[PDB]
Design a protein around this ligand. Structure first.
Ligand SMILES: CO[C@@H]1CC/C=C/c2cccc(c2)[C@@H](C)OC(=O)[C@@H]2CCCN(N2)C(=O)[C@H](Cc2cccc(O)c2)NC(=O)[C@H](C(C)C)NC(=O)[C@@H]1C
Length: 163
């Protein structure tokens, strides 16, 4: 019953590949639903056309700012920000999908995809999914990242939706 969504990733406007995610609605339904709806665009806004603004090889890829496009923006389907739903799931390894934030209870739309175990984020960021297919695409994305996260090419979500 867990939903699956996809991102079609582009590099400077040319196709890279598709990353698909399982969303763990069975443990974090509110957080899963936010990501699902932002992926379909059914609220009239969402991830389509937004970029991955911070990519740190060996760590994570971060995106989701569709309002300001400067790493500070984005919003949830619940108004602006929402509470940390729970911290049941941990940052256990490559492929983990988790909410970016600016402290407790500040979930919007920004998210990150781990490429490693990042246990120091446990209890601070809500884990709500995992890459299902296309981890090789996430690994390809890392080539365009850097130590401080600035990307060397424009890495965009050209299209996205629910499977
Ligand atoms: C532009 O907006 C600034 C961001 C300040 C810059 C943070 C920064 C810069 C370079 C590398 C890193 C962090 C590495 C080590 O960490 C991540 O990439 C982590 C990895 C998990 C996802 N993530 N970033 C996050 O969730 C971060 C967590 C964070 C915030 C502040 C300082 C810090 O060291 C880490 N939150 C943010 O990026 C948020 C946005 C979600 C609105 N921005 C903010 O809070 C303020 C307003």
């Amino acid at each position: 019953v867990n939903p699956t969504v996809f991102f079609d990733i582009a590099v400077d406007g040319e196709p890279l590949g598709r990353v698909s995610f399982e969303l763990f609605a069975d443990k974090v339904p509110k957080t899963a639903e936010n990501f699902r709806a932002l992926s379909t665009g059914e609220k009239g806004f969402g991830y389509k056309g937004s970029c991955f603004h911070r990519i740190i090889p060996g760590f994570m890829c971060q995106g989701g700012d569709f309002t300001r496009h400067n790493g500070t923006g984005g919003k949830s389907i619940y108004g602006e920000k929402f509470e940390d739903e729970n911290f049941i799931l941990k940052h256990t390894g490559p492929g983990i999908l988790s909410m970016a934030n600016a402290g407790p209870n500040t979930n919007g739309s920004q998210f990150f995809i781990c490429t490693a175990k990042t246990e120091w984020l446990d209890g601070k960021h809500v884990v709500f999914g995992k890459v299902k297919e296309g981890m090789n695409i996430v690994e390809a994305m890392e080539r365009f990242g850097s130590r401080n996260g600035k990307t060397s090419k424009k890495i965009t979500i050209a299209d996205c939706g629910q499977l």
